[PDB]
Amino acid sequence: MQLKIYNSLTGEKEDFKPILEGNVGMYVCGPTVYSNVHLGNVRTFLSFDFIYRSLQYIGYKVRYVRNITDAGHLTDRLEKLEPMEIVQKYTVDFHEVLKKFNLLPPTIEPTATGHIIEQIELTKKLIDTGFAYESNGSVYFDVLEYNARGLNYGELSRRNIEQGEKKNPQDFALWKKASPQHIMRWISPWGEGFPGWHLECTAMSTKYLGDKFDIHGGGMDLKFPHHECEIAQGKACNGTEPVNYWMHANMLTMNGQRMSKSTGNYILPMELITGNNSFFEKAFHPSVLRFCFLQAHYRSVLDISNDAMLASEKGFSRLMDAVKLVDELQVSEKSTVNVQEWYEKAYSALVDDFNSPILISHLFEAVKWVFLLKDGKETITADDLAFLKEKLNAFVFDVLGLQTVE
Amino acid sequence: MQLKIYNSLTGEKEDFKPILEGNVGMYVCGPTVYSNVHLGNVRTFLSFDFIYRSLQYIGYKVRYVRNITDAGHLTDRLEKLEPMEIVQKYTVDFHEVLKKFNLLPPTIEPTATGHIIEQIELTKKLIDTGFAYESNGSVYFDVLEYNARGLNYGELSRRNIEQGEKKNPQDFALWKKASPQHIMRWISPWGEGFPGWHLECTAMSTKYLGDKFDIHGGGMDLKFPHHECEIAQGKACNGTEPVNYWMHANMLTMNGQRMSKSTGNYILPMELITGNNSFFEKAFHPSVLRFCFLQAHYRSVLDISNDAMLASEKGFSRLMDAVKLVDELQVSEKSTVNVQEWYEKAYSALVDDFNSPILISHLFEAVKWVFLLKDGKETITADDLAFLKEKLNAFVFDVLGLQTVE
Ligand SMILES: [Cl-]
Ligand SMILES: [Cl-]
Ligand SMILES: [Cl-]
Ligand SMILES: [Cl-]
Ligand SMILES: [Cl-]
Ligand SMILES: [Cl-]
Ligand SMILES: [Zn+2]
Ligand SMILES: [Zn+2]
């Protein structure tokens, strides 16, 4: 049956209907490469990797854009320190981490510094159209004028709760004047400055996907102000909503507690992989970690603990044992298991807002069958075996993105 | 003793003298990511990886900039094909290839699209200064005026051998008008266009290293026109030579013949690694391939063949066997080998224009000693053994960039 996606705009699961048949344009907010990528951000990027893989298995042609914030968003020549040196250091580490977790590369991976010119044009566009105003070298988005025209700022997060350069405190910066402390700067119509965080993603998303595209993803912390500002920028620039489906991935906790460097309940991705940490009793292969992650729904809070990870590992091994045993299973003239029925149960879970936990459970029905088949307690024809092998590898390696561990 | 570097400007080995004590600024021309990275380009990037590593072992603080040409140099929205999709595909593959060959990441890795704004300013600079002129939306560098002022175009390649928009046929483009066929374009003072290849590297090199920096590297095919144009651009912009030491890596051949897709004498890096090719009789670990490469001097032509690679592999194994056997060697009260003398021979080869073949030969003296030590035919004190272990691992893993193969 057809795919359903939870949409943060409406708070309900919706029939997914693409703007262009057989095609999906998809944008996910990427890392700010001024420090090491956090584990919770890895989960978000892994969740949208799974979603990207699933959209392709279903047969869509998916253009997946995921940006890199290498300029601005500071809220996050040999003797002079170089911002681009830092950017390079954490960009490389970011890609090494994601490669270990077997994430596919996105179709396009634009950088904010790669699109200053496009962002300066959008700022001009919003100034000339009345949605923005220059103030002491910066440019701010006029929230109250945006509202007076009826465009409803806050429709995503559904909130109205809670300096001198701005007409109103809720105005946000599209362009910021560079102070002498700012090394990264660019000439512009308003002096030397650097981009506002939110306008980077609007310039980059619409350039490669259009004024309106199917899916926009990110962590739930981006819902406000970031994604709220992307919506307002897109509606004020193009006169239409930029995104039909807004997807938000949920938090990650450890031992039921929030991940905090200040609390001490903190662990970097590599520390969890290598076991160089005091929360987990061993090292863990990233595919085991990925398996564990996918046992939680991307909109659920994922909690990692030593006992939960060990349980995921035991379940991971059983799955892969069956995967190896399929190539050696014997064949009978009749099948006492219904592979067609299992695949329909597995597939429906997948197109039910990418329900990886339920999908994994249906995979265990096939795992249980493989060990039963091996001991002659069940039988299977050659055609059903070929079908079982194709579907099970496709779910395990292509959709879930798991991989074998020697 | 002190480092000597061959300089293409003078055609001789020169005492290396840095612009700033204990520091090296270093720029190497990077790949054009519109196709798969060629093996010969891998050799060039591997040669400068070795050089980068060697400059650090010697104790210099090295800022290594290596660019990416993701816009322009074409001489090299869901339904519309996307240049940035292609760029992304071959950028990822480029980094995966180099990671397999154990190259370090450069300190900064700028992209041409990341610096359109800086390149537009340099073009203005050269127009206002008389070195360049607008012509039908493009901007061209005036070679004859550059020469009339005495700046000698051609000092690098030492040549003068061998359309309607240009004052003279030797003029080269700093900025090119975009035709409707060009998807990649940018607004500018002269209309919509895209950067000229040569001016990308001048804007990017000087921004992160200064108006004059120590070393500029690249393949020997870049000497003209590319590096000749970088010299002219830097001298016309800044009134001084941009580079004190010009380094050029030489060609790669297979079976004594030129690598050509048209000839059929062609092999991609991954095909050589995986053995999925008809020139080599097996697969080869990239560290073995890297060892083979470093047995040729970076300014020599490297020829790869099945018999040469097998010989390199046999020599690679012997080296690593000794490397493993050092931790188990027994110690005596006296040393019948002079580790101090060997290290001085090994180090002098290194600072003799990065003479990896000679350095590897001196490493085999230490390899020969390790097998002799194991059989009691030679002796060594504990202090000499500790020194031998430190220097030999440092040359093998840190300088040569080799790695163990399980
Ligand atoms: Cl972002
Ligand atoms: Cl703001
Ligand atoms: Cl997840
Ligand atoms: Cl280049
Ligand atoms: Cl030209
Ligand atoms: Cl070499
Ligand atoms: Zn964003
Ligand atoms: Zn270059």
Side-chain angles (χ1 to χ4, degrees), chain A residues 1-11 13-16 18-20 22-76 78 81-159 164-180 182-260 262-323 325-332 335-376 378-405, chain B residues 1-11 13-16 18-20 22-76 78 81-159 164-180 182-260 262-323 325-332 335-376 378-405:
Chain A
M1 51 181 59
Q2 52 108 47
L3 164 65
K4 272 197 162 208
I5 301 186
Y6 186 88
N7 190 344
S8 292
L9 272 180
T10 56
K13 295 183 182 174
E14 300 182 4
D15 302 311
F16 175 64
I19 297 179
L20 180 79
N23 281 272
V24 171
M26 189 192 177
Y27 186 91
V28 174
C29 282
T32 287
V33 285
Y34 301 152
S35 59
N36 292 118
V37 58
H38 290 7
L39 193 55
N41 285 274
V42 178
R43 188 205 175 191
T44 298
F45 300 137
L46 190 145
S47 282
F48 287 105
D49 181 60
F50 164 58
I51 287 156
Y52 169 56
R53 294 165 171 272
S54 298
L55 288 170
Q56 284 179 323
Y57 180 77
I58 293 167
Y60 288 111
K61 185 192 175 186
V62 188
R63 168 177 294 176
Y64 179 14
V65 181
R66 189 188 65 202
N67 68 290
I68 292 187
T69 304
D70 63 336
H73 191 199
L74 314 174
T75 315
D76 178 84
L78 252 71
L81 186 138
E82 183 53 55
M84 282 298 109
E85 190 166 349
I86 297 176
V87 163
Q88 164 70 345
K89 168 181 183 189
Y90 297 115
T91 300
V92 167
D93 169 70
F94 164 74
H95 285 143
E96 293 183 329
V97 170
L98 297 204
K99 164 59 69 182
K100 281 169 167 142
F101 282 88
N102 196 18
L103 277 74
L104 298 177
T107 312
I108 311 173
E109 195 159 358
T111 64
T113 59
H115 302 88
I116 305 291
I117 296 190
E118 291 84 356
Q119 167 156 7
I120 290 178
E121 292 308 299
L122 289 196
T123 301
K124 294 191 202 176
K125 223 269 182 185
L126 298 165
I127 291 177
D128 187 74
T129 292
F131 288 108
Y133 58 91
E134 187 272 349
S135 174
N136 188 38
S138 295
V139 178
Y140 298 98
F141 191 96
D142 193 338
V143 172
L144 291 197
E145 179 68 21
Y146 178 94
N147 281 349
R149 307 183 183 190
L151 304 182
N152 186 28
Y153 182 76
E155 59 182 35
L156 190 48
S157 53
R158 311 199 185 101
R159 82 169 69 194
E165 315 200 323
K166 313 197 295 183
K167 290 171 183 174
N168 306 111
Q170 47 274 78
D171 300 338
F172 54 92
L174 314 175
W175 185 266
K176 300 198 204 220
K177 185 192 186 188
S179 83
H182 290 103
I183 299 166
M184 275 204 280
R185 49 181 66 210
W186 291 269
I187 193 58
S188 81
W190 321 280
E192 283 176 355
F194 55 92
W197 180 26
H198 320 309
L199 194 52
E200 293 163 6
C201 284
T202 283
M204 282 185 293
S205 65
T206 53
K207 173 178 186 186
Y208 301 113
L209 305 168
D211 294 0
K212 185 199 297 303
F213 52 92
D214 300 309
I215 297 170
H216 193 322
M220 224 163 286
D221 59 313
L222 303 184
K223 192 176 296 192
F224 183 85
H226 192 48
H227 293 174
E228 203 70 69
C229 292
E230 277 185 71
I231 291 173
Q233 286 159 181
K235 290 170 66 167
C237 275
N238 310 320
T240 185
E241 296 274 351
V243 173
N244 290 336
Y245 301 86
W246 282 96
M247 315 188 66
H248 291 94
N250 207 332
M251 311 271 262
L252 166 60
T253 59
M254 174 159 61
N255 292 326
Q257 285 307 316
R258 168 187 169 258
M259 294 256 202
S260 185
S262 51
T263 283
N265 204 39
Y266 190 58
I267 189 176
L268 290 176
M270 295 301 191
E271 294 168 340
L272 174 62
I273 295 181
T274 65
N276 174 236
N277 69 83
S278 63
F279 303 94
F280 296 86
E281 74 179 38
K282 68 197 289 288
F284 288 113
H285 191 285
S287 208
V288 173
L289 299 173
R290 175 177 183 122
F291 178 73
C292 186
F293 285 16
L294 290 167
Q295 290 187 298
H297 184 267
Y298 71 99
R299 288 181 300 115
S300 297
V301 178
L302 170 70
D303 181 70
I304 56 168
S305 71
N306 189 63
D307 292 273
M309 201 60 73
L310 293 182
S312 292
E313 189 179 32
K314 199 172 179 301
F316 181 89
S317 298
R318 171 170 166 89
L319 170 57
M320 294 310 198
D321 284 348
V323 168
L325 287 182
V326 166
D327 300 23
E328 73 173 51
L329 279 176
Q330 267 313 113
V331 172
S332 294
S335 300
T336 62
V337 295
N338 187 349
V339 298
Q340 211 67 38
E341 186 174 80
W342 159 86
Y343 174 76
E344 286 307 317
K345 292 196 274 187
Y347 187 94
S348 293
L350 181 57
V351 303
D352 176 47
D353 191 47
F354 309 98
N355 199 339
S356 57
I358 300 302
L359 165 62
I360 285 173
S361 265
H362 297 310
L363 291 187
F364 273 134
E365 188 175 7
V367 171
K368 188 190 61 172
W369 286 354
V370 171
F371 293 105
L372 291 172
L373 289 173
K374 185 196 181 190
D375 304 307
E378 302 270 8
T379 78
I380 183 167
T381 68
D383 289 356
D384 287 339
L385 186 57
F387 173 87
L388 214 170
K389 187 190 178 192
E390 168 200 331
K391 297 314 183 184
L392 178 72
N393 292 331
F395 286 128
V396 164
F397 300 105
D398 300 334
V399 172
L400 294 175
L402 304 179
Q403 49 188 14
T404 57
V405 184
Chain B
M1 51 181 59
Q2 52 108 47
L3 164 65
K4 272 197 162 208
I5 301 186
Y6 186 88
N7 190 344
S8 292
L9 272 180
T10 56
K13 295 183 182 174
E14 300 182 4
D15 302 311
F16 175 64
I19 297 179
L20 180 79
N23 281 272
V24 171
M26 189 192 177
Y27 186 91
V28 174
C29 282
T32 287
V33 285
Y34 301 152
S35 59
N36 292 118
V37 58
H38 290 7
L39 193 55
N41 285 274
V42 178
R43 188 205 175 191
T44 298
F45 300 137
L46 190 145
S47 282
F48 287 105
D49 181 60
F50 164 58
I51 287 156
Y52 169 56
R53 294 165 171 272
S54 298
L55 288 170
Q56 284 179 323
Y57 180 77
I58 293 167
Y60 288 111
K61 185 192 175 186
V62 188
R63 168 177 294 176
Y64 179 14
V65 181
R66 189 188 65 202
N67 68 290
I68 292 187
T69 304
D70 63 336
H73 191 199
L74 314 174
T75 315
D76 178 84
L78 252 71
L81 186 138
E82 183 53 55
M84 282 298 109
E85 190 166 349
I86 297 176
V87 163
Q88 164 70 345
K89 168 181 183 189
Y90 297 115
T91 300
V92 167
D93 169 70
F94 164 74
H95 285 143
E96 293 183 329
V97 170
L98 297 204
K99 164 59 69 182
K100 281 169 167 142
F101 282 88
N102 196 18
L103 277 74
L104 298 177
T107 312
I108 311 173
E109 195 159 358
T111 64
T113 59
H115 302 88
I116 305 291
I117 296 190
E118 291 84 356
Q119 167 156 7
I120 290 178
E121 292 308 299
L122 289 196
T123 301
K124 294 191 202 176
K125 223 269 182 185
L126 298 165
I127 291 177
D128 187 74
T129 292
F131 288 108
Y133 58 91
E134 187 272 349
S135 174
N136 188 38
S138 295
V139 178
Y140 298 98
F141 191 96
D142 193 338
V143 172
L144 291 197
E145 179 68 21
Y146 178 94
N147 281 349
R149 307 183 183 190
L151 304 182
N152 186 28
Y153 182 76
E155 59 182 35
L156 190 48
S157 53
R158 311 199 185 101
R159 82 169 69 194
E165 315 200 323
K166 313 197 295 183
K167 290 171 183 174
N168 306 111
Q170 47 274 78
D171 300 338
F172 54 92
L174 314 175
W175 185 266
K176 300 198 204 220
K177 185 192 186 188
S179 83
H182 290 103
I183 299 166
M184 275 204 280
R185 49 181 66 210
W186 291 269
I187 193 58
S188 81
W190 321 280
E192 283 176 355
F194 55 92
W197 180 26
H198 320 309
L199 194 52
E200 293 163 6
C201 284
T202 283
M204 282 185 293
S205 65
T206 53
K207 173 178 186 186
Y208 301 113
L209 305 168
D211 294 0
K212 185 199 297 303
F213 52 92
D214 300 309
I215 297 170
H216 193 322
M220 224 163 286
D221 59 313
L222 303 184
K223 192 176 296 192
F224 183 85
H226 192 48
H227 293 174
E228 203 70 69
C229 292
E230 277 185 71
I231 291 173
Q233 286 159 181
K235 290 170 66 167
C237 275
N238 310 320
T240 185
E241 296 274 351
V243 173
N244 290 336
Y245 301 86
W246 282 96
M247 315 188 66
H248 291 94
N250 207 332
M251 311 271 262
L252 166 60
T253 59
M254 174 159 61
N255 292 326
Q257 285 307 316
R258 168 187 169 258
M259 294 256 202
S260 185
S262 51
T263 283
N265 204 39
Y266 190 58
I267 189 176
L268 290 176
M270 295 301 191
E271 294 168 340
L272 174 62
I273 295 181
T274 65
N276 174 236
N277 69 83
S278 63
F279 303 94
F280 296 86
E281 74 179 38
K282 68 197 289 288
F284 288 113
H285 191 285
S287 208
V288 173
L289 299 173
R290 175 177 183 122
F291 178 73
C292 186
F293 285 16
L294 290 167
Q295 290 187 298
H297 184 267
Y298 71 99
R299 288 181 300 115
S300 297
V301 178
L302 170 70
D303 181 70
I304 56 168
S305 71
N306 189 63
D307 292 273
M309 201 60 73
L310 293 182
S312 292
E313 189 179 32
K314 199 172 179 301
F316 181 89
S317 298
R318 171 170 166 89
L319 170 57
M320 294 310 198
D321 284 348
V323 168
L325 287 182
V326 166
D327 300 23
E328 73 173 51
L329 279 176
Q330 267 313 113
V331 172
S332 294
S335 300
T336 62
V337 295
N338 187 349
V339 298
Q340 211 67 38
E341 186 174 80
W342 159 86
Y343 174 76
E344 286 307 317
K345 292 196 274 187
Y347 187 94
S348 293
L350 181 57
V351 303
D352 176 47
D353 191 47
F354 309 98
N355 199 339
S356 57
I358 300 302
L359 165 62
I360 285 173
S361 265
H362 297 310
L363 291 187
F364 273 134
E365 188 175 7
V367 171
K368 188 190 61 172
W369 286 354
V370 171
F371 293 105
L372 291 172
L373 289 173
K374 185 196 181 190
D375 304 307
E378 302 270 8
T379 78
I380 183 167
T381 68
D383 289 356
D384 287 339
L385 186 57
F387 173 87
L388 214 170
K389 187 190 178 192
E390 168 200 331
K391 297 314 183 184
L392 178 72
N393 292 331
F395 286 128
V396 164
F397 300 105
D398 300 334
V399 172
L400 294 175
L402 304 179
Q403 49 188 14
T404 57
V405 184

